[PDB]
Design a protein around this ligand. Structure first.
Ligand SMILES: [Ca+2]
Ligand SMILES: [Ca+2]
Ligand SMILES: [Ca+2]
Ligand SMILES: [Ca+2]
Ligand SMILES: [Ca+2]
Ligand SMILES: [Ca+2]
Ligand SMILES: [Ca+2]
Ligand SMILES: [Ca+2]
Ligand SMILES: [Ca+2]
Ligand SMILES: [Cl-]
Ligand SMILES: [Cl-]
Ligand SMILES: [Cl-]
Lengths: 149, 149, 149
């Protein structure tokens, strides 16, 4: 019977949707995602900003963005080295915005940053001490993506 | 056409089920699962026993349980900190049982443990050195889940 | 209904196929896979060569094979301890071939290796320092699987 097979197929598809959802949960858990918190992942590869941005988006995430000290600390722990943050002032010099929209609020600028040094610096990296430095978007820094809570 | 379409979709589904099964195997492997051994994993987050139980159960797992000295060590090195074990004596004081049912067989209690200190201590935690301590279930310890061998 | 349901189910299947691809990409990413580079994974378990092969085949990969100094170091950094390479002279004594077929193109043999020492040595392990030594395929070494770029 055609309808019986179709009904079975529906059940099979729904069963797969739930198993996949579980696979995703377990992987996030195994990757250190904390309950009700965003999770950060890195392959430890250094690349220019646009490449990090393209990579994270492909994975359905975004370049990591610290919204407070806890998150900033978590990103630093994950990155282990200087990494790009999802913050830039490429649209209008001086006004840093999140790659996902909106003006930068919480910050952790290193002493004397941001300074748009020399020919210009429109991207931001969280350096080893967790402090921030605006740098050239063309420099290669560790790719770190964040995924929703 | 409908009979063929349906037949070909069922085949697609079977391939996808196998592919998902592969993803699960590769993930466990990457997370250090040893052949014929249970898979222990943690996100490194500390919480009350009731939560770890709910969390592990949501991932189709249970709170880690050392059935012998080998598994007890395996759990210790995964947790890195004091983690809840799937054992409590909430039913009969002194009679510790696994959350999955059954009487406690292997144990690695610390000197003077269990002591059911203060108002009571019905949960168990494997402390840093692998030794056990009975502790209040309302306290917050590392969440470590186990998955079948 | 029937054809509408069937059309929806094809859409459901394709959507699920994309989500799973996404899941695999994110896992490879978290597993340290760099762009355009093959990647290596290990559960850190020691086992005879035949088991490494079986395990990697089940994961749809192959035993790690270094094609150049770049990959040789990458394999060594993942294994951390001596691991089997997908290279053996089992078919014809003295003729080292890749498990995937073909004669060696790159080699980092430690001085005086390979020597088929004593009762015989047909497998190869990358020692902690990257050099190669032919050893017994019966010995238990770290399993490192290789996945395509
Ligand atoms: Ca500018
Ligand atoms: Ca600027
Ligand atoms: Ca600067
Ligand atoms: Ca009690
Ligand atoms: Ca008690
Ligand atoms: Ca106690
Ligand atoms: Ca031989
Ligand atoms: Ca030989
Ligand atoms: Ca030798
Ligand atoms: Cl720039
Ligand atoms: Cl208690
Ligand atoms: Cl041999």
């Amino acid at each position: 019977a055609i309808e019986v097979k179709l009904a079975n197929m529906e059940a099979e598809i729904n069963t797969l949707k739930s198993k996949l959802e579980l696979t995703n949960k377990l992987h996030a858990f195994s990757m250190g995602k904390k309950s009700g918190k965003k999770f950060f992942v890195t392959n430890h590869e250094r690349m220019p900003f646009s490449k990090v941005k393209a990579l994270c988006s492909e994975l359905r995430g975004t370049v990591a963005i610290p919204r407070n000290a806890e998150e900033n600390k978590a990103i630093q722990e994950v990155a282990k080295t200087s990494a790009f943050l999802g913050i830039t002032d490429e649209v209008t010099e001086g006004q840093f915005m999140y790659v996902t929209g909106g003006r930068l609020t919480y910050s952790n600028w290193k002493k004397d940053e941001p300074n748009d040094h020399g020919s210009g610096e429109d991207c931001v990296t969280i350096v080893d001490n967790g402090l921030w430095n605006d740098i050239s978007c063309q420099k290669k820094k560790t790719a770190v993506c964040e995924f929703p809570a």
